[PDB]
């Protein structure tokens, strides 16, 4: 294995209707398990997975405060930024923050990271050593010194280094089933002819988990043709994903082509032919 515990926070200012929207979604690699939505009919931290249901009030209450406090600082933050940029309070802006920690295939801390973005762009990134910040703008520099004089990297590092890894562990456990279970790709090719002398071959991978997958169309030995149209992996809506690669072939030649499909839930790679 190799795992990650990561959160994504978003704050969007709402001019007319006061208080900015604050969303917060957490993940144990690829599986959302919690979320806070200050807009939701319940402004509280809720479980998004079922293995999370077996969690006591203490946790939910605590995490609810955390998200609430962040929402608060983020509201202060959005104000400050509106200032650094000399911006009207009548327009909307977005503050995003992503942070996560990763484990080694060997089960301990690997790397940790943290970043903020404003109006869609990088703003302040916590450095690799996890002891420093890189502003990306000059407003960001003010945020950068403010940050260092305050010692934020310090905190962030602790969390990132213990807390974060320690709980990832606990979550992997409570999600023993779901989380460590791989689902391979149902596979298949399809023919959709274009002209009198050529068709499209489409290699399909459906229902797989996790989402990392690799589809390749190669003809009789060598690799990658002139055109492999490859759609962004997508969600089926059930926990699994879908993906497909297409290539255009001259009729008759349809078996000169083979599609290879790679996926963790496959004891070994799979080859398809029309």
């Amino acid at each position: 294995g190799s795992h990650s515990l990561k959160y994504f926070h978003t704050s969007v200012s709402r001019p007319g209707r006061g208080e900015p929207r604050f969303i917060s979604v957490g993940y144990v690699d690829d599986t959302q398990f919690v979320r806070f939505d200050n807009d939701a009919a319940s402004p509280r931290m809720v479980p998004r997975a079922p293995w999370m249901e077996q969690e006591g009030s203490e946790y939910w209450d605590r995490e609810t405060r955390s998200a609430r406090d962040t929402a608060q600082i983020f509201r202060v933050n959005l104000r400050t930024l509106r200032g650094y940029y000399n911006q009207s309070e009548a327009g909307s802006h977005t503050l995003q923050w992503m942070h996560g920690c990763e484990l080694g295939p060997d089960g301990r801390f690997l790397r940790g990271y943290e970043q903020f973005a404003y109006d869609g762009k990088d703003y302040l990134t916590l450095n690799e050593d996890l002891r420093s910040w890189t502003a990306v703008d000059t407003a960001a520099q003010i945020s950068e010194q403010k940050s260092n004089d305050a010692s934020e990297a310090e905190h962030q590092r602790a969390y990132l280094e213990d807390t974060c890894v320690e709980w990832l562990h606990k979550y992997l456990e409570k999600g023993k089933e779901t989380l460590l279970h791989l689902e391979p790709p149902k596979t298949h090719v399809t023919h959709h002819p274009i002209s009198d002398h050529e068709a499209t071959l489409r290699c399909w991978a459906l229902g797989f988990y996790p989402a990392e997958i690799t589809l390749t169309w190669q003809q009789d030995g060598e690799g990658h043709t002139q055109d492999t149209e490859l759609v962004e992996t997508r969600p089926a809506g059930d926990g699994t994903f879908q993906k497909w690669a297409a290539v255009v072939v001259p009729s008759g030649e349809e078996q000169a082509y083979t599609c290879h499909v790679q996926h963790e839930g496959l004891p070994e790679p799979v080859t398809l032919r029309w």
Binding site: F8, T10, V12, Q32, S92, Q96, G120, K121
Partner: protein, 100 residues
């Protein structure tokens, strides 16, 4: 201020099976800012009671959501997804094609 236009993919949970119940999906991604309008359409009409996931974003900070609804493919019925966003002159409509 950075803006990214939405990428759209209309596509069902399970392979299209005329008469066999399913789930219709409109997957919008890689957009900024996060205000977006997404409607599922059935022969031009907007399907009521559609659902979507929790706003979330990816590494390049762009957002993505999945909108969906239960449905039943037919050889005649025409389905589509209609999306709106600041980055779009006018809503963009992309038709479901059971082949994708």
């Amino acid at each position: 201020m950075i803006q990214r236009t939405p990428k759209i993919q209309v596509y069902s949970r399970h392979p299209a099976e005329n008469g066999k119940s399913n789930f219709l999906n409109c997957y919008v991604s890689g957009f900024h800012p996060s205000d977006i309008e997404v409607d599922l359409l059935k022969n031009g009409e907007r399907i009521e009671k559609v659902e979507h996931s929790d706003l979330s974003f990816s590494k390049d900070w762009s957002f993505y959501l999945l909108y969906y609804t239960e449905f039943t493919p037919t050889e005649k019925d025409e389905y589509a997804c209609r999306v709106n966003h600041v980055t779009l002159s006018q809503p963009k409509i992309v038709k479901w094609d059971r082949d994708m």
